[PDB]
Amino acid sequence: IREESSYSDIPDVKNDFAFMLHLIDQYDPLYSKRFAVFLSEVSENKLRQLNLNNEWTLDKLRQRLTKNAQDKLELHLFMLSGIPDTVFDLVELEVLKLELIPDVTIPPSIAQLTGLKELWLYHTAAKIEAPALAFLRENLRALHIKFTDIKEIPLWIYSLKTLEELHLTGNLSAENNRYIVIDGLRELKRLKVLRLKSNLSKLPQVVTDVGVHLQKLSINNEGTKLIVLNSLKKMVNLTELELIRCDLERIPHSIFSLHNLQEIDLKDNNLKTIEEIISFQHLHRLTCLKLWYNHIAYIPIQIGNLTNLERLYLNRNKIEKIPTQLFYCRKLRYLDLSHNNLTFLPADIGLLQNLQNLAVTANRIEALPPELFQCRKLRALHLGNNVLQSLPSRVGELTNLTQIELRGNRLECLPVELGECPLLKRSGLVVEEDLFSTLPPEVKERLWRADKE
């Protein structure tokens, strides 16, 4: 029966159950075949699929639909025996997240997902059919592949010629055959965002080849040392370069040749001296520059030459002092210096008229300069975990202040001038209740009413 009809998931029968089956076979093999299906495993899994389809009705899936951070409708499937056939009846679905779903075939019914843009294959090797493959080739924009094994990467993903954003999660390098599964990335002619979290010990050649049109390269070696070794100065169309946990311990000189770069992230690179930023004057559009989570001991005065900076991140470092040249960047809008050994703020901090977020959390700031309150559009502040002795009375000058963090300081009384901020609400006043009790009752009532409205 199973050699003809191809149902190999029927194990041989042991004692006292093969005897009765032999008797039945002598009477009529029809009963043998009517029993074999019910004893098979393929049939049980298919019946499980049908029960899944019946259980996850369209209303159930719609109630299960959520919206991710990007305000997109999301369906995250976890530990299901397969893709329910009714997940393709929701035309409003935008992102399909599949995690730990085995023996999964993408049906042609996925073509009904006109609004589908992102497909997350979490530890899921899925086969696809020609209609569904063509639909995804014409429609799918983003693909998230997380794999503990090379073979778990579907091999049809290189035929998606409208893909723009590919996220590779999982170790891919191997001995004597490295960077060959991703030889098909050249065929992704419309790829723009390439995220590589694979413990690369050297940037694969195909990445450099496909980077001529890449606009954002993101690498997360999770501790592995990454050697660029002159493989990065060809992606002149790049505008965002993220090197997270690459263990660089040094800024490579290949970055400064990317004349179109705007956002450079160097998180967890164990940076010590960042005096390489003198070469960043070549990048004539460098707006955001994240250097957080490093061992940076000092901010070089050459950071003043980067007059086009708007966002500067230097938190989680070993910075002890702030140079006065840092305040030559009058375009600066974010200056996050949280978790540092800073003890005071230079008076030039008020020169940055466009500063809007200033976090100095977890420092040794015992007092704030009065010049700090010249930044009238300072929407948010974070002065928590400091050693602030007293809050200056000029806090009310910042009319646009909305969210100010104050828990963890050595404060005794909150200023009455703190309540004159037109937009500050109890939600935006993060402070201990003992300190909050010091406000005048009019201020308390106004804050509570604002929080209500």
Epitope: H253, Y298, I301
Partner: nanobody, 114 residues
């Protein structure tokens, strides 16, 4: 105990060549970035050039690109600033800056061009 002192400045015609010497005592010159700065009278100080701590990577300002040169010698522990194709605009006082533990500035050599 690092001393930064400049020499080789003066008054020279335009379109010529001039050379500056920055004397470093307390630190090896090849192991720290050396920055040349200029300050025009009645003007904020302007960066001139820099040398990397490795690979002989050099940086120059946009207005002075292709005209000035920077070099250093570890045997004698000095930084050379070679000024070429000079103009009355490049009349400023030149400083060689370093950061070895703290901020260090040179004495400053007066440079004037006709």
């Amino acid at each position: 105990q690092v001393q930064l002192v400049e020499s080789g400045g003066g008054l020279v015609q335009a379109g010529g060549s001039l050379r500056l010497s920055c004397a470093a005592s307390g630190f090896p010159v090849g192991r720290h970035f050396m920055y040349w700065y200029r300050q025009a009278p009645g003007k904020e100080r302007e960066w001139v050039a820099a040398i990397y701590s490795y690979g002989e990577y050099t940086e120059y300002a946009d207005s002075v690109k292709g005209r000035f040169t920077i070099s250093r010698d570890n045997a004698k522990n000095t930084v050379y600033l070679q000024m070429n194709s000079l103009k009355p605009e490049d009349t400023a006082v030149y400083y060689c800056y370093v950061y070895v533990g703290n901020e260090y500035w040179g004495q400053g050599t007066q440079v004037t061009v006709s």
